Amino acid sequence: PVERMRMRPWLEEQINSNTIPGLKWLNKEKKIFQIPWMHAARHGWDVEKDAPLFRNWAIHTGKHQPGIDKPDPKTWKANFRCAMNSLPDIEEVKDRSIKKGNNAFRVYRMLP
């Protein structure tokens, strides 16, 4: 019911399995993974690219339960960002004025 699969390995798995067309290890040897994120919908509309992950956050991070509480995706969006400010081994890189004409995702370098 309330287990702790751990986000670090949860991502190492999703990234290795390549469940989202864009999220994946750019350099798995040094553990570098990049996700596309919902750069399009900053709230809740064009946010289906990473919604399967973002939505799983509520169940994977043990925060929302289907049948007992309300499935609010608005907070799930913020939950995703908290993970980026966590695990003292992740380096987020979304570019600033160069790679901004194709996708502009968030490349995260994860240490061991």
Separation CA 70–CA 94 (nearest Å): 32
Tokens representing 51?
Answer: 């919604």
**Secondary structure letter of residue 9 according to DSSP:** H
Query: Across the strands, what pairs with 93?
Result: 107
Question: What are the backbone angles phi and psi of residue 34, rounded to the nearest 5°?
Answer: -125, 135
CATH number reported for the structural domain that contains residue 78 in this entry: 1.10.10.10
The span from the CA of 69 to the CA of 67, in Å, is 6
Query: DSSP for 26-95?
Result: EEGGGTEEEE-TTSS-SSSSS--SSHHHHHHHHHHTT---BTTB---HHHHHHHHHHHHTSSTTEEEE--
Between the alpha carbon of residue 110 and those of residues 30, 56, 73, 90, the distances in Å are: 8, 21, 26, 4
Domain count, the chain: 1
Q: Structure tokens of 7?
A: 């986000």
For the CA atoms of 12, 13, 14, 17, the dihedral, rounded to the nearest 10 degrees, stands at 120
Segments forming the whole domain that contains residue 64: 1-112
**Which experimental approach was used here?**
NMR
Of 45, 31, 19, the residue nearest 110 (C-alpha): 31
Classify burial at 60, counting beta carbons within 10 Å of its beta carbon; exposed 0-12, middle 13-18, buried 19 or more.
middle
Q: How far apart are CA 51 and CA 12, in angstroms?
A: 18
